[PDB]
Symmetry: C3
Subunit: 345 residues, 3 copies
Amino acid sequence: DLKLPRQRVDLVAPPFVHVHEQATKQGPKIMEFKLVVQEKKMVIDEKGTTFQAMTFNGSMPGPLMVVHEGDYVEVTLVNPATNTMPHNIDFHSATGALGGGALTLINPGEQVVLRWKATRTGVFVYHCAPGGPMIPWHVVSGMNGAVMVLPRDGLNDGHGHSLRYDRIYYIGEQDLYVPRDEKGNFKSYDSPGEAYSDTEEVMRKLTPTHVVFNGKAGALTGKNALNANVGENVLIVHSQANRDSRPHLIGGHGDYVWETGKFSNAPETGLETWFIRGGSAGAALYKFLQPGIYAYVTHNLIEAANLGATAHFKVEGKWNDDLMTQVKAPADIPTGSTNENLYFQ
Amino acid sequence: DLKLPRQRVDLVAPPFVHVHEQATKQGPKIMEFKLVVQEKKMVIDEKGTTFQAMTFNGSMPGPLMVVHEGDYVEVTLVNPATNTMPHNIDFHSATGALGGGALTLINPGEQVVLRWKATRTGVFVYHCAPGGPMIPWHVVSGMNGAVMVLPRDGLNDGHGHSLRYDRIYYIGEQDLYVPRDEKGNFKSYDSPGEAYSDTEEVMRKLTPTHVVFNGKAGALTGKNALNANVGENVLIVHSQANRDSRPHLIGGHGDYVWETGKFSNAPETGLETWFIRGGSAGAALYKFLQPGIYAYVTHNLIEAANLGATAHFKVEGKWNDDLMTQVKAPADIPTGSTNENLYFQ
Amino acid sequence: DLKLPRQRVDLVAPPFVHVHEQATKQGPKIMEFKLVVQEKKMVIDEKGTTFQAMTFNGSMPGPLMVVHEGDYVEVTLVNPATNTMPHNIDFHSATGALGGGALTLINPGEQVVLRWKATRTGVFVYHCAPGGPMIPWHVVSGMNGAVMVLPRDGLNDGHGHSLRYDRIYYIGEQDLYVPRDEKGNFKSYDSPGEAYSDTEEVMRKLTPTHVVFNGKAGALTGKNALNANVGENVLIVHSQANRDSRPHLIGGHGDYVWETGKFSNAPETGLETWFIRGGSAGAALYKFLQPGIYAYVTHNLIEAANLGATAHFKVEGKWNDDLMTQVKAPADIPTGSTNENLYFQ
Ligand SMILES: OC[C@H]1O[C@@](CO)(O[C@H]2O[C@H](CO)[C@@H](O)[C@H](O)[C@H]2O)[C@@H](O)[C@@H]1O
Ligand SMILES: OC[C@H]1O[C@@](CO)(O[C@H]2O[C@H](CO)[C@@H](O)[C@H](O)[C@H]2O)[C@@H](O)[C@@H]1O
Ligand SMILES: OC[C@H]1O[C@@](CO)(O[C@H]2O[C@H](CO)[C@@H](O)[C@H](O)[C@H]2O)[C@@H](O)[C@@H]1O
Ligand SMILES: [Cu+2]
Ligand SMILES: [Cu+2]
Ligand SMILES: [Cu+2]
Ligand SMILES: [Cu+2]
Ligand SMILES: [Cu+2]
Ligand SMILES: [Cu+2]
């Protein structure tokens, strides 16, 4: 009885996003997505530590889905028989049945089709939630992503002016809880079920061993740094399904930030650092003004530098010496300088 | 010299709330409340672990007090001689004398009467705060609750429109720090003073052993799930006197959320997850649109599923298939399906 | 080529602030500041525990710098040859080159001059960030402070009304990670490099051993309590470069709070407790209404009372019995009282 046009969307691996319109004059459609659960061993840090992960579509995070207010979203969730456990999906964007989790529980070898109406704008988490202690375990094993529900007129500044991004990236942050042996080395396991008991003990102490973007320490540095150009307005969606985070663009700002992630609320302006509450997605716009490397971190700097939570942007363009300049390069402290008379000595 | 009508309020145990008017045309009154401290052993999880608690009025949290802007609140605090320690009360709603703590210190066998003017609207924490290390210990032992100071015109949406709730619940979240023996089992004690030294060591590492609503894991699930009906606008007050929390209604949203808890500020709309800073109360309105079970959690899912922090609502009414529907029930993955050609394989 | 007046600013040790205008009719200037790195052993708690600190200008936090929107800020950063490590500076207020860190790396015996344009209003963190694991280590060793960029018209309430403070204090909160020996006693070291390996292990578990204001437990209590007077509007800037905090003025409120710290956003009103995300500075105004002692804490009360995070204000003036009064002093519970019939017994 729901007589609307159907459109199939092909998702892409984060931190990229499938193509979409920002503002649209198309009416509501049924937007069709497919997510396939994949349990597999994954490498999660620069020393090669492996982890028994569980994913949507083989990535941590799962891919970003993008629709417009009033669309219907029809998700086929597939759990191949190569997997060992039941899985489901819960959309924080959806209304009813535990976000869809109570309608999508599938054993290996099965698939299910859920439809939810996109009545709430913003970026939102989706994650697996099978029941009881399996909920946190599936989520911290990798089974979470995000969906963006755009207004049909695209984003605005909360004061009646349109905003448009030239570029979008999705940064999924994952807290991981990897057991260690008596000597302090990370332990390896042959299957998720084998890893569970030891992993649950680490989870109970609430302190992650790794905090990563795009599934691994160093995923978005080096060759895989994020590209941008001076003058571009870049939307950075950030999600964390289980634990708080405090994003910060080193050398930049958040020009417009929806830290609670919901476009019915005006963004805040000119933030240094914002706050993603565990169990949510937020979004920040920034117009790059300077070329060079930027680090994007959670600004618990221990997590950023020592547990894996740093991405880079590589921005091309011309340097603006009015905004910042090195007036004098490093030089020997003048013989004549008198710093021993300063108030704090 | 304060010549206003007096009205005695009988409090009730959370998560229920004493009856009150939302909007009122009554002028300011002296609203009289009594809180009696009770130290006692309490059961805090589904395995029967017991805990040396300290409470206001025998419950964790202490009861919700509800008054209107401009009322005076006259609290008789009683510390029966069956108790072993001094106690006091500090209202985050009040101005002066450490919130009242510096005027309310009572030994066992004594009572004291404090009056504070309700000049600030919102939901606010109250808690015991005897002095020094006793402050966190009394609070994490259970001695905290909340007070709501309504505008005289009731709540509004921050844009000039009245909001009215059909139902109110108060969810007090408690972080607990229970010692374990060498084998990892929770230890039992015969008195609060006996529990102190071992408990302070757990407190110092800042990681709770239990995170509970209404005083115990499973308190608000099963027979004690919270009731609602499709169409009702429900106000959920949430407090945490010592530690942050990130509330989330699984399958719903926060239609209007005051996460910092103060009604002079417009609420945010359409939240997935909000944030209660430790030492505060916040509030969310939601109009139920779908029947069924909802879980209300902190969305650190480890705390929610494994440390006790899940409540349920049981909502009666008719399902809306437009908002969400199971298009196809779980079925075998079609022989003809081609998932091995997906980009992530 | 930048032809503006230069003005030298002499900084002062926190929690005080160098003199400045709030509103100004002066045009943009080049505001010249000097920061000298000092590595030294410091006492950090009331038991005399010492710590291998690294500081700007010999204090934790580093001093508050105050300029106006559109000023240029020219910082000479000095690293004396008595220091052992390279250092740099990153301003969250600045645009480009990792906030200045990529232009300011200096070895012992060198100095460098950085200029950044103050294009963003608010309070912002600055901190050392040499590269890789040295970033969190230098920051949690003490190398962080804040800068305030005022609008030229001074502060406003976000609704078109000027706000002016009579008094300003800067509270820098520091999370510290001090190793312990097998017996649980804090370990002492002869140099920062000697302390590193053991300190990094404590840092990795993300749980501080001390959380302090102005560099030490008890720094702002006793003789060094903060002064104020009934009727004064006091601005409290609070920063935390690495870890979240939840400030609360016990016995007061935040009348106007910019918890994300940026003056382009209207403040929230009448807060009990606010939230400083790690990696940021926020600010609260409060007009004192009552004399006496107030405690200013982070409202994780364990951190406040047991890990060092309490300051005091001592406020002079006349008590207002309308706002709060002790109606009846502590007295024996009346023989006739009937508390055994209360609902919770
Ligand atoms: O309360 C009536 C009864 O209806 C049930 C039957 O399973 O299902 C309702 O809710 C489901 C979503 O949770 C819908 O898919 C279904 O169509 C609707 O009838 C039970 O939940 C309930 O006990
Ligand atoms: O500064 C004068 C002196 O007055 C004291 C006496 O105890 O009390 C004032 O403040 C109290 C609340 O903290 C009020 O109950 C009292 O009525 C008021 O006089 C001292 O705090 C102070 O040293
Ligand atoms: O992309 C060109 C090239 O210019 C460099 C040379 O070091 O420097 C630019 O950016 C610096 C700030 O990071 C400015 O101080 C400098 O003036 C500007 O030319 C390189 O970063 C870059 O590879
Ligand atoms: Cu799963
Ligand atoms: Cu969820
Ligand atoms: Cu008490
Ligand atoms: Cu308090
Ligand atoms: Cu340094
Ligand atoms: Cu920084």
